Coordinates of C-alpha atoms in Angstrom, one line a residue:
Chain R
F1 CA 0.0 0.1 0.1
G2 CA 3.1 2.3 -0.5
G3 CA 2.0 2.7 -4.1
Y4 CA -0.8 4.3 -5.9
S5 CA -4.5 3.1 -5.9
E6 CA -6.9 3.7 -8.7
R7 CA -10.2 5.5 -8.1
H8 CA -13.2 8.7 -9.5
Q9 CA -15.7 10.7 -11.5
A10 CA -18.1 10.8 -8.7
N11 CA -16.1 13.6 -6.9
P12 CA -15.3 17.1 -8.0
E13 CA -12.3 17.0 -5.5
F14 CA -10.3 15.3 -8.2
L15 CA -11.8 17.5 -11.1
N16 CA -11.0 20.8 -9.2
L17 CA -7.4 19.4 -8.7
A18 CA -7.1 18.7 -12.5
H19 CA -7.9 22.0 -13.2
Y20 CA -5.7 23.5 -10.6
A21 CA -2.7 21.6 -12.2
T22 CA -3.4 22.4 -15.7
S23 CA -3.9 25.9 -15.5
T24 CA -1.0 26.2 -13.2
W25 CA 1.4 24.3 -15.4
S26 CA 0.4 25.8 -18.7
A27 CA 0.6 29.4 -17.5
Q28 CA 4.5 28.8 -17.4
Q29 CA 5.3 27.4 -20.8
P30 CA 6.8 29.3 -23.8
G31 CA 4.8 30.3 -26.9
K32 CA 1.8 30.2 -24.6
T33 CA -0.9 32.9 -25.2
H34 CA -3.8 30.8 -23.5
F35 CA -4.4 28.7 -20.4
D36 CA -4.6 25.0 -21.2
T37 CA -7.9 23.4 -19.6
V38 CA -9.3 20.0 -18.7
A39 CA -11.1 18.2 -21.6
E40 CA -11.2 15.1 -19.4
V41 CA -10.0 13.5 -16.4
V42 CA -9.0 9.9 -17.7
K43 CA -7.4 8.3 -14.5
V44 CA -7.1 9.4 -11.0
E45 CA -4.6 7.6 -8.5
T46 CA -3.8 8.6 -4.9
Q47 CA -0.8 7.7 -2.8
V48 CA -0.4 8.7 0.7
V49 CA 3.0 10.4 1.5
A50 CA 3.9 10.3 5.2
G51 CA 7.1 10.1 7.2
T52 CA 9.9 12.4 8.5
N53 CA 12.6 14.6 6.9
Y54 CA 16.1 14.5 8.6
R55 CA 18.2 17.4 7.5
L56 CA 21.7 16.4 8.9
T57 CA 24.7 18.8 9.1
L58 CA 27.7 16.6 9.3
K59 CA 31.4 16.6 9.7
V60 CA 32.5 14.2 6.9
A61 CA 35.9 12.5 6.2
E62 CA 37.5 9.9 4.1
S63 CA 37.1 6.4 6.1
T64 CA 39.4 3.3 6.4
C65 CA 37.3 1.2 4.3
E66 CA 37.5 0.6 0.4
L67 CA 34.7 0.9 -1.9
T68 CA 35.1 -2.7 -2.6
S69 CA 34.2 -3.7 0.8
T70 CA 30.9 -3.8 2.8
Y71 CA 30.6 -0.5 4.9
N72 CA 30.4 -1.0 8.6
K73 CA 30.3 2.1 10.9
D74 CA 32.1 0.4 13.7
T75 CA 35.2 -0.6 11.5
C76 CA 35.2 2.2 8.7
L77 CA 36.3 4.7 11.0
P78 CA 37.5 8.2 10.0
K79 CA 41.2 8.4 8.8
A80 CA 43.0 10.5 11.4
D81 CA 44.8 12.4 8.3
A82 CA 41.6 12.9 6.5
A83 CA 40.3 16.4 6.1
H84 CA 36.9 16.9 7.8
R85 CA 34.4 18.8 5.6
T86 CA 31.0 20.3 6.7
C87 CA 28.3 18.7 4.6
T88 CA 24.5 18.8 4.5
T89 CA 22.0 16.4 3.4
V90 CA 18.3 15.5 3.9
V91 CA 17.3 12.0 4.5
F92 CA 13.5 10.9 4.0
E93 CA 12.0 8.2 6.0
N94 CA 8.6 7.0 5.3
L95 CA 6.8 4.4 7.7
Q96 CA 8.0 1.4 5.7
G97 CA 11.6 2.6 6.6
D98 CA 12.5 3.3 3.1
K99 CA 15.2 6.2 2.9
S100 CA 16.5 8.3 0.3
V101 CA 19.4 10.7 0.6
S102 CA 19.6 13.9 -1.0
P103 CA 23.0 14.7 -2.7
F104 CA 25.5 16.0 -0.1
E105 CA 26.3 19.8 -0.3
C106 CA 29.6 20.7 1.1
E107 CA 31.4 23.8 2.1
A108 CA 34.6 24.3 -0.1
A109 CA 36.9 26.1 2.4
Chain D
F1 CA 5.3 24.2 12.7
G2 CA 5.4 23.2 8.9
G3 CA 9.0 23.4 9.0
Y4 CA 12.5 22.2 10.6
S5 CA 12.3 21.9 14.2
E6 CA 15.9 21.5 15.8
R7 CA 17.3 18.8 18.0
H8 CA 21.3 15.6 19.2
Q9 CA 24.7 13.7 19.4
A10 CA 23.6 11.5 22.1
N11 CA 20.9 10.0 19.9
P12 CA 21.8 6.6 18.3
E13 CA 19.2 6.9 15.6
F14 CA 20.4 10.0 14.2
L15 CA 24.0 8.6 14.1
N16 CA 22.8 5.5 12.2
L17 CA 20.9 7.8 9.7
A18 CA 24.1 9.9 9.1
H19 CA 26.2 6.7 8.6
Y20 CA 23.5 5.4 6.3
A21 CA 23.3 8.7 4.3
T22 CA 27.2 9.0 4.2
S23 CA 28.2 5.6 3.1
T24 CA 25.4 5.5 0.5
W25 CA 26.2 8.9 -1.1
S26 CA 30.0 8.7 -1.3
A27 CA 29.9 5.3 -2.9
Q28 CA 28.2 6.7 -6.0
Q29 CA 30.8 9.4 -6.0
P30 CA 33.4 9.4 -8.8
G31 CA 37.1 9.6 -8.1
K32 CA 36.4 8.4 -4.7
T33 CA 38.1 5.0 -3.7
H34 CA 37.1 4.9 -0.1
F35 CA 33.9 5.3 1.8
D36 CA 33.4 8.7 3.6
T37 CA 32.3 8.3 7.1
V38 CA 30.9 10.3 10.0
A39 CA 33.5 12.3 12.0
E40 CA 30.7 14.4 13.7
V41 CA 27.0 14.8 13.6
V42 CA 26.8 18.6 14.0
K43 CA 23.1 19.4 13.7
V44 CA 19.9 17.5 13.2
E45 CA 16.6 19.1 12.2
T46 CA 13.6 16.9 11.5
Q47 CA 10.3 17.7 9.7
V48 CA 7.2 15.6 9.5
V49 CA 5.8 15.0 5.9
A50 CA 2.2 14.6 5.3
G51 CA 0.1 14.6 2.1
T52 CA -1.3 12.9 -0.7
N53 CA 0.1 12.4 -4.2
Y54 CA -2.5 12.6 -6.9
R55 CA -1.4 11.2 -10.2
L56 CA -3.7 12.4 -13.0
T57 CA -4.3 11.2 -16.5
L58 CA -5.7 14.0 -18.4
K59 CA -7.2 15.1 -21.9
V60 CA -5.8 18.8 -22.2
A61 CA -7.1 21.5 -24.6
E62 CA -6.2 25.1 -25.4
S63 CA -8.9 27.1 -23.3
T64 CA -10.8 30.4 -24.4
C65 CA -8.9 32.5 -21.8
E66 CA -5.7 34.5 -22.2
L67 CA -2.7 34.0 -19.8
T68 CA -3.1 37.8 -19.1
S69 CA -6.3 37.0 -17.2
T70 CA -7.6 35.1 -14.1
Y71 CA -8.4 31.4 -14.9
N72 CA -11.7 30.0 -13.9
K73 CA -12.7 26.3 -14.5
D74 CA -16.2 27.7 -15.6
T75 CA -15.3 30.3 -17.7
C76 CA -12.1 29.0 -19.4
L77 CA -13.6 26.1 -21.4
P78 CA -11.9 23.9 -24.0
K79 CA -11.7 25.5 -27.5
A80 CA -14.2 23.4 -29.8
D81 CA -11.4 22.8 -32.4
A82 CA -8.5 22.4 -30.0
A83 CA -6.5 19.2 -30.4
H84 CA -6.8 17.2 -27.2
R85 CA -3.6 15.7 -25.7
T86 CA -3.1 12.9 -23.0
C87 CA -1.0 14.2 -20.3
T88 CA 0.1 12.8 -17.0
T89 CA 1.0 14.9 -14.0
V90 CA 1.4 14.3 -10.1
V91 CA -0.1 16.8 -7.6
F92 CA 1.0 16.7 -4.2
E93 CA -1.0 18.3 -1.4
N94 CA 0.1 18.7 2.0
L95 CA -2.2 18.9 5.1
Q96 CA -2.4 22.6 4.9
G97 CA -3.6 22.8 1.3
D98 CA -0.4 23.9 -0.5
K99 CA -0.1 22.0 -3.7
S100 CA 2.8 21.1 -6.1
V101 CA 2.6 20.1 -9.9
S102 CA 5.1 17.8 -11.6
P103 CA 5.8 18.9 -15.1
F104 CA 3.0 17.6 -17.4
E105 CA 4.5 14.6 -19.3
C106 CA 2.3 14.7 -22.4
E107 CA 2.1 12.1 -25.3
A108 CA 3.8 12.3 -28.4
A109 CA 1.1 10.6 -30.4

């Protein structure tokens, strides 16, 4: 139940949302003189998105482990030589436990 | 309230998320031969995500209304001779009512 579920016609919620989307989108394209509108709602699917976003500011450094090996935090320790970099990421974690890791942004200094 | 609430080093779960994020991200990085790891969890901000994703399949048509004007589902009807296109889009809506629209992926046909 983490994916979409088909529906729909017997509710204006979906229609009024199709209109929103279509005027919103088409009022930004090039070559456009008119709003686009809805000729027909063909299919509707809903999917609940619930979880929590983890914005992590981190000191990051080259570890002792090679990419060829399986990463373990207890033994892939930070190299005493390595430069520390201040980095930011967001990790999203829905109820299922599935995580996605936004691309690290790091201060260049 | 609808944004990042701060928290953080004492907490194992945040530490585990920081290792997951770091190991995962740096693996996919080019040039890199070793894993990056966590020297330090500096800051942790969380953020509850609640909403519904609406995937829409639509028939779209040029409307009677100019872009220089206020769209109205009841006034901006589809032009009688306008070609219809089958378009897909997702519309997220948070618990507040604030909506986002993915770019309409139309159909080449």
